[PDB]
């Protein structure tokens, strides 16, 4: 009855903080393209929504753009979670779950999302749950300490997500921990 239900192979979700080495980790699977459906985070979609860079606007003016940005993230995630494939294995960077439990909940906490906007997103999440199939068979948590994550971010000659405070990575770290450690199967890796 749910959309995409029974159309998806064994699926693995790569979860981790900003700067936990997810892009790096996923580069290793690229030789296996032909047997593995391999979906990196759709940052490029977020940067170019018919010309508008949602990601930037979100980092620039969070109180105006958090709602639209997260709405869109959620869409692009669903678009991945549901994309048809012939391959026997599917691997995604992040998921609708990280969006809901980490990033959105964090924007609510530090006050960038007003309660009214948050609730709108949350009613959607509830409705998505009932109407779309999001296949999820195993999560690989690339665990790290906020401090180690900060390093990388700044090492990387880089761009958007680039300009985040440590307190923010701390807050995100804790949310990932609440979701992944303190309570499908979770495989924790030390990415230090």
Ligand X SMILES: Nc1ccn([C@H]2CC[C@@H](COP(=O)(O)O)O2)c(=O)n1
Q: What share of residues in the chain are helix, strand, coil (percent, to 5)? A: 50, 15, 30
Q: Is 23 annotated as a binding residue?
A: yes
User: What does residue 124 show for φ and ψ, rounded to 5 degrees?
Assistant: -55, -50
Establish if 107 lies at the interface with a second copy (CB under 8 A).
no
Q: Which tokens go with 182?
A: 């303190």
Asked if residue 21 belongs to a known ligand binding site, the reply is: yes
Burial class (CB in 10 A: 0-12, 13-18, 19+), 67: buried
Residue 79 interacting entry, from ligand X, a second copy, none, C-beta within 5 to 8 Å by type? a second copy
Is 44 catalytic? The answer is no
| Cβ at position 177, least distance to ligand X in Å | 17
> What does the per-residue mask of binding to ligand X show for 57-86, with x meaning CB under 6 A?
-------------x--x-------------
In the chain the beta strands, taken as DSSP E runs, fall at: 10-16, 36-39, 89-93, 138-143, 185-190
Calpha distance 164→170 (Å, rounded): 11
> Binding of a second copy at residue 49 (CB under 8 A)?
yes
Binding site for a second copy (CB under 8 A): 1-4, 49-52, 54, 57, 64-65, 67-68, 71-72, 75, 78-79, 82, 114-117, 119-120, 123-124, 127, 131-132
Q: Any idea which residues carry the catalytic annotation?
A: 93
């Amino acid at each position: 009855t749910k959309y995409a239900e029974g159309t998806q192979p064994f699926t693995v979700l790569i979860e981790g903080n900003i700067g936990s080495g997810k892009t790096t980790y996923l580069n290793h699977f690229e030789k296996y393209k032909n047997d593995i459906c391999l979906l990196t985070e759709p940052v490029e979609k977020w940067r170019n929504v018919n010309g508008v860079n949602l990601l930037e606007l979100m980092y620039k003016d969070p109180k105006k753009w958090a709602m639209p940005f997260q709405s869109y993230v959620t869409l692009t995630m669903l678009q991945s979670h549901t994309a048809p494939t012939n391959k026997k294995l599917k691997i995604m960077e992040r998921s609708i779950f990280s969006a809901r439990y980490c990033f959105v909940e964090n924007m609510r906490r530090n006050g960038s999302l007003e309660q009214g906007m948050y609730n709108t997103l949350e009613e959607w999440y509830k409705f998505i749950e009932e109407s779309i199939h999001v296949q999820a068979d195993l999560i690989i948590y690339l665990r790290t300490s906020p401090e180690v994550a900060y390093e990388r971010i700044r090492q990387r000659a880089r761009s958007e997500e680039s300009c985040v405070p440590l307190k923010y990575l701390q807050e995100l770290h804790e949310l990932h921990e609440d979701w992944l450690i303190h309570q499908c199967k979770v495989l924790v890796l030390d990415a230090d």
